[PDB]
Design a binder for these strands. Sequence first.
RNA 1: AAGGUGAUAUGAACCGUUAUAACCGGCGAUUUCCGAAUGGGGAAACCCAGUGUGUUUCGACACACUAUCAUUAACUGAAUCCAUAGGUUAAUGAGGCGAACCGGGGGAACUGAAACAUCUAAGUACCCCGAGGAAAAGAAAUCAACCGAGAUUCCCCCAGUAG
RNA 2: UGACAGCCCCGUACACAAAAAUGCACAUGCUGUGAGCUCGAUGAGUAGGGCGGGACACGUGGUAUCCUGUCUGAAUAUGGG
RNA 3: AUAAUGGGUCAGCGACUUAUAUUCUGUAGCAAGGUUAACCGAAUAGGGGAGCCGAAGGGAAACCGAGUCUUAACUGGGCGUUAAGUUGCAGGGUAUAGACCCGAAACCCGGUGAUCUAGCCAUGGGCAGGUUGAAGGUUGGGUAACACUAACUGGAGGACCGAACCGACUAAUGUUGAAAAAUUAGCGGAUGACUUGUGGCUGGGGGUGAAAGGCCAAUCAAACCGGGAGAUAGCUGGUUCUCCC
RNA 4: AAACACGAAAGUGGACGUAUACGGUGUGACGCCUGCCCGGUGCCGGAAGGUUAAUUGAUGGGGUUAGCGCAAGCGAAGCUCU
RNA 5: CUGCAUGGCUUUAAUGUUUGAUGUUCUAACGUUGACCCGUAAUCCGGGUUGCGGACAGUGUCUGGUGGGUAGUUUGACUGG
RNA 6: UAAGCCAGCUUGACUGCGAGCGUGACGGCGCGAGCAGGUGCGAAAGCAGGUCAUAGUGAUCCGGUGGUUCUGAAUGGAAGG
Lengths: 50, 77
Amino acid sequence: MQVILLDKVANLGSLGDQVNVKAGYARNFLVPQGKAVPATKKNIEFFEAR
Amino acid sequence: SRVCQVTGKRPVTGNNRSHALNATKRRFLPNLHSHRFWVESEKRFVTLRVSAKGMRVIDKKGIDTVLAELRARGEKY
RNA sequence: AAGGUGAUAUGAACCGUUAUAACCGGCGAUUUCCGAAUGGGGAAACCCAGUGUGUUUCGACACACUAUCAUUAACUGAAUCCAUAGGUUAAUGAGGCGAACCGGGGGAACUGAAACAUCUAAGUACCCCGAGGAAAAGAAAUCAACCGAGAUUCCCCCAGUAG
RNA sequence: UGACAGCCCCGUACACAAAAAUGCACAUGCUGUGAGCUCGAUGAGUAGGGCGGGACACGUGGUAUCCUGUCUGAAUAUGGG
RNA sequence: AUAAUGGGUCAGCGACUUAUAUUCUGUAGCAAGGUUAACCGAAUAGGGGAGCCGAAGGGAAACCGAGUCUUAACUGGGCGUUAAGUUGCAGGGUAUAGACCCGAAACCCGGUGAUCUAGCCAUGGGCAGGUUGAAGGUUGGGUAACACUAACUGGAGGACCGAACCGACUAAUGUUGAAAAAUUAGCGGAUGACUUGUGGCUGGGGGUGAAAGGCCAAUCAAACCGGGAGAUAGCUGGUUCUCCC
RNA sequence: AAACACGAAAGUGGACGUAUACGGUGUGACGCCUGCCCGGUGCCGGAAGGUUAAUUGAUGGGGUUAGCGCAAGCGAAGCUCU
RNA sequence: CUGCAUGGCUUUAAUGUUUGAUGUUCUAACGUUGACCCGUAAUCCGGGUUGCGGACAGUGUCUGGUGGGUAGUUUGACUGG
RNA sequence: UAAGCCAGCUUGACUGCGAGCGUGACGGCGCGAGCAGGUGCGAAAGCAGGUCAUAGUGAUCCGGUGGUUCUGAAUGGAAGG
Ligand SMILES: [Mg+2]
Ligand SMILES: [Mg+2]
Ligand SMILES: [Mg+2]
Ligand SMILES: [Mg+2]
Ligand SMILES: [Mg+2]
Ligand SMILES: [Mg+2]
Ligand SMILES: [Mg+2]
Ligand SMILES: [Mg+2]
Ligand SMILES: [Mg+2]
Ligand SMILES: [Mg+2]
Ligand SMILES: [Mg+2]
Ligand SMILES: [Mg+2]
Ligand SMILES: [Mg+2]
Ligand SMILES: [Mg+2]
Ligand SMILES: [Mg+2]
Ligand SMILES: [Mg+2]
Ligand SMILES: [Mg+2]
Ligand SMILES: [Mg+2]
């Protein structure tokens, strides 16, 4: 569960980095709260074009 | 029933075995939980009775796919 | 087709003999009530309805339809405006029964070991779900042993051998 | 059939018969369905592993192999069993 | 003879089977060979020699071979080298099966039972007649007022005597009964933890139990019906015509 | 959301009760009373220390072999048995 | 003797991390047999809002303890019974 | 002739075999001259394969250890046997 950010956020905030977050942190808060999204190897290209 | 809506995991029967190998019937049943999942693609939460792994699948494949299944298969949800 | 109206079963009254007597076969028609029973109920073969129809005697009764689930559509439509859930209608299909064979979910103990736990009986008996005329299996991430074979299934060997 | 019938009766061998409905084959009509050539693609919460069981003739045994309740988790043809 | 078992009598039925393996005997075929299995089939033929047995043994084995193993090695020693096998058919044994027939007490599985009884739930019914006289009350007496006291009134109680009703202490009768649990004479309770009609709920290692292992349909230290099932029985019983050694 | 009981579970009883309540156990109206023993077994309390499960996997040893060699033997890395 | 103003690729321990133990805080999984709202004239369920609780509780797999609550069994023969 | 007593030197309490016997239902147990290799004591003939003899003991299975080119599931090894 690496995911890519969206806004700032915690000791990793950056509007679009590849972090390595704990899954529960990921699929219970950030994504449902729209602060990140999974890095599904398709996603590692849209925020790897900027 | 204790069936994982994602994997179809259900209880399975096996044995106990003592140090003397006495067999006593028993069941392994799955690590169910039931969990509010955000879809966004429907602006709603859906509670699936899900196994861990069921979760780990949802993590990987991603919810909507999994929801294509279930619906593809007829699961209520 | 010259004789017929099933049997116990006579009798009555009939029907027929050159083709609508009977009898046999094909396809139709009728097909009360209960029973999956399906309009609601219920002590099975009964009680009671909603809605539609029906009456030169247009009341009350008779008949038809109204179960549930699924799929699809249509129309409707909360908390919440959107949107959903919910609700009505409609079209389809399901439901119950049935000898074995078949696949699947569960799964004994007696017994054997000259006792008994491991082991056996045995994945047997039994319960359950499902399907077909057969079921299942099946087109090598298989064997072989440096030579080669070429899906699955069944029969005889291999052998009561190796383990 | 009044006792044991090739020639009494009903049959049997053999040869024939279907107005209708049907099983089975073909042949087509209607519906639904896709064929063909070029260039591609090649089945990941999987294989494998840890724990617990179960299956394989095989009782965990030096035990390959298969299945998975549980926690994990690759390579991708110069690759993998 | 037994006073040890079994048989009232007759008739009919009633117990060593079947299949597949293996070995021995007989017999048959062929013979250092014998024989095919499935299957094909002109279907008891014919085909099919996959295969099985035998012709070589010894050694755990590699391996060697009329020898081989043992040991560094045998004067040796062990097992072998000299006699034929094999396939049918009949029979004697054995193996696997219910394996000669009948018989348990039980264990497991799925069902059917609270029309008896236990307890509980709901809704209805019953208790002739006669006693006892609790709290309380009233009025006099009595207290400073209460206390207390006498009458009268009142009508308490798992209260009293006693029918219906509910019980079941004694005895006799009955014991192939009138009755698989009663009759007669006495006995207990009889406004209560009473008793009763109807209907409901609880299920088998489970119910219910004012507790006896009681009751759960004349069944209870684990109900009944069907099944596993021909459980198993080193025990008891029985085991059928004749003659010869 | 009691303990507790039926129940794979949902649930239900306990109770539409709430410590003057409810379950369990022993004793058994009343009167006068109920002495000694916590070593054993049980129960209650006990944040120290000793021993201790799955788990985690340090280290040591073995197998294989690129390489080294005439071979005796050594054995990188990986994979493995332990 | 060195420094305080001035003169031609570590143990004695601490800033960024990947990682355990304990303690506080948070909400966002999870609980709610609090309250209100809708489905809905409904003490079931669901959805919704909210308060409470909160990474606890509970559950799955694994695991040490306890375990006649329950089950299957064993508990020798000789013998002057 | 001591098997009894004392002393010197010693490892025959040796390895491979074993004619022939005894004794057991059997599993087994016992006695044994002699052959081969190597050894001790003795000048030598010789004697020694434990003790004056008869008790001093435990089948198989499972497993440990050392040895062993005998086996090694494609082949070389290894595991295992
Ligand atoms: Mg009806
Ligand atoms: Mg009905
Ligand atoms: Mg036995
Ligand atoms: Mg080739
Ligand atoms: Mg492929
Ligand atoms: Mg006499
Ligand atoms: Mg007699
Ligand atoms: Mg009753
Ligand atoms: Mg009284
Ligand atoms: Mg009285
Ligand atoms: Mg009775
Ligand atoms: Mg019997
Ligand atoms: Mg049996
Ligand atoms: Mg007493
Ligand atoms: Mg017991
Ligand atoms: Mg037993
Ligand atoms: Mg005895
Ligand atoms: Mg191999």
